[PDB]
Design a protein around this motif. Sequence first.
Motif, PDB file in Angstrom:
ATOM      1  N   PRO A 264       0.801  -1.241   0.000  1.00 59.25           N
ATOM      2  CA  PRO A 264       0.000   0.000   0.000  1.00 59.25           C
ATOM      3  C   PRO A 264       0.831   1.289   0.000  1.00 59.25           C
ATOM      4  CG  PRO A 264      -0.972  -1.597   1.467  1.00 59.25           C
ATOM      5  CD  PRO A 264       0.371  -2.139   1.092  1.00 59.25           C
ATOM      6  N   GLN A 265       1.910   1.360   0.819  1.00 60.21           N
ATOM      7  CA  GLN A 265       2.751   2.568   0.871  1.00 60.21           C
ATOM      8  C   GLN A 265       3.425   2.887  -0.477  1.00 60.21           C
ATOM      9  OE1 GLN A 265       2.625   5.242   3.235  1.00 60.21           O
ATOM     10  NE2 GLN A 265       3.782   6.083   1.510  1.00 60.21           N
ATOM     11  N   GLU A 266       3.927   1.859  -1.191  1.00 59.47           N
ATOM     12  CA  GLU A 266       4.527   1.987  -2.522  1.00 59.47           C
ATOM     13  C   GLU A 266       3.465   2.519  -3.503  1.00 59.47           C
ATOM     14  OE1 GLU A 266       7.781  -1.751  -2.194  1.00 59.47           O
ATOM     15  OE2 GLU A 266       5.903  -2.075  -3.300  1.00 59.47           O
ATOM     16  N   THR A 267       2.221   2.009  -3.394  1.00 62.16           N
ATOM     17  CA  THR A 267       1.058   2.414  -4.194  1.00 62.16           C
ATOM     18  C   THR A 267       0.785   3.919  -3.996  1.00 62.16           C
ATOM     19  OG1 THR A 267       0.167   0.154  -4.081  1.00 62.16           O
ATOM     20  CG2 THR A 267      -1.398   1.877  -4.645  1.00 62.16           C
ATOM     21  N   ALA A 268       0.768   4.406  -2.730  1.00 65.96           N
ATOM     22  CA  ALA A 268       0.529   5.822  -2.455  1.00 65.96           C
ATOM     23  C   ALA A 268       1.669   6.674  -3.014  1.00 65.96           C
ATOM     24  CB  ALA A 268       0.361   6.069  -0.964  1.00 65.96           C
ATOM     25  N   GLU A 269       2.928   6.225  -2.853  1.00 67.85           N
ATOM     26  CA  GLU A 269       4.099   6.951  -3.336  1.00 67.85           C
ATOM     27  C   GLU A 269       4.102   7.148  -4.857  1.00 67.85           C
ATOM     28  OE1 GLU A 269       7.237   4.761  -1.309  1.00 67.85           O
ATOM     29  OE2 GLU A 269       6.987   5.965   0.524  1.00 67.85           O
ATOM     30  N   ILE A 270       3.820   6.083  -5.620  1.00 70.21           N
ATOM     31  CA  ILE A 270       3.806   6.111  -7.090  1.00 70.21           C
ATOM     32  C   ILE A 270       2.539   6.756  -7.696  1.00 70.21           C
ATOM     33  CG2 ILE A 270       3.924   4.642  -9.205  1.00 70.21           C
ATOM     34  CD1 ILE A 270       5.528   2.557  -7.265  1.00 70.21           C
ATOM     35  N   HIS A 271       1.338   6.415  -7.176  1.00 72.84           N
ATOM     36  CA  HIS A 271       0.051   6.802  -7.763  1.00 72.84           C
ATOM     37  C   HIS A 271      -0.828   7.819  -7.038  1.00 72.84           C
ATOM     38  CE1 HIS A 271       0.372   3.586 -10.726  1.00 72.84           C
ATOM     39  NE2 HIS A 271       0.878   2.827  -9.752  1.00 72.84           N
TER      40      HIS A 271
END
Length: 273
Positions: A264-271
Motif C-alpha cells: 500500500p505505501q509503494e502504491t501511495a508513493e507512485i500513484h
Amino acid sequence: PLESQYQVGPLLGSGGFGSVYSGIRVSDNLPVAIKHVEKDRISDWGELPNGTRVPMEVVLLKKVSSGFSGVIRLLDWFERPDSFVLILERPEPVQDLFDFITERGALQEELARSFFWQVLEAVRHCHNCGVLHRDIKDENILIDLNRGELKLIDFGSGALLKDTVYTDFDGTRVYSPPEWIRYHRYHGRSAAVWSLGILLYDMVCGDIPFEHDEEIIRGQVFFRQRVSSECQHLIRWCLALRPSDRPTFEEIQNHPWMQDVLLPQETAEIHLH
Ligand SMILES: COc1ccc(-c2cc(N)[nH]n2)cc1
C-alpha cells in the motif's frame, strides 16, 4: 452521553444507508464518522452475544471490527427512541473509489492490481469472521490517500455467511449475478466473486460492463479500453455464467495477473502522492 462525547461536524453523505456526519471524539480529538439510521427503515435485525435487539449492521460490524485495517471499524453505537447511532473510524484525507475513478478515469493496471488485491484480502477477512458483505462496489470502498490503504464500508445489506442458498437480495442490481436475476437464488461466495469481476472491469475500464438484466444474463464481456490479455482472462473467469465455473479466492490470488502486487505505501508513493 453521546452528545457530549462527540463534536458533530458537517454532513459527509446520505442515501439508502442513512446520514453520515464528520466528527471528532472529544477525549483524544480522534477523527470519527457518525452514522444515523432510522429504526422504521431497518428490515434486518439481529442480536449481539448478550442478546440486545440491534440492526444486523451492528452485529456484522462487531464480528469484523478487530485489528485488520481493511474494513472500517465500529468504535461504538447508541440507541435513541427512533434511531440507532454508529461511531465509525474516519481516515483523513479520504476519497471513495467511485469518486476516484470518476475524476481520474480508467486505472493503470499496476494501480488496479494493488487496489483489487486489498479488496480481496478485506473480503477474505469478512468471510473468515462469518460475514457476507453483499454490496461490494466502488461506492463502498474508501481510499486512505496517505497510506494507500483501502477500507470496505456499508454492511447495511450484509448477512451472516452460510453454506445454503440465499433467496433475498438488497444490494446493487448491476453488481448482482445472473442466477439472482434469473432464479432469485444464489450462494454467498460465488455471488461475491461475480461482484468482484464487475468491480475489476470497473477499475480497468472506468465503467461497469452491464446495465440491463439481458446483458447480465448473456454475460458477454466487451472491452471498451486497452486491457491486457491476463486481466481480461481473470475478469471473464469471475464473470462465468455458471456459479461453479467461477474461480475461488485462492484461484483469483494465484492468477498470473495478480503476481508482484505493490505494498500500500509503494502504491501511495507512485500513484496517490
Ligand atoms: C468519509 O468517511 C466515512 C467513514 C465511514 C463511513 C461508513 C462506514 C460504514 N459501515 N458505513 N459508512 C462512511 C464514510
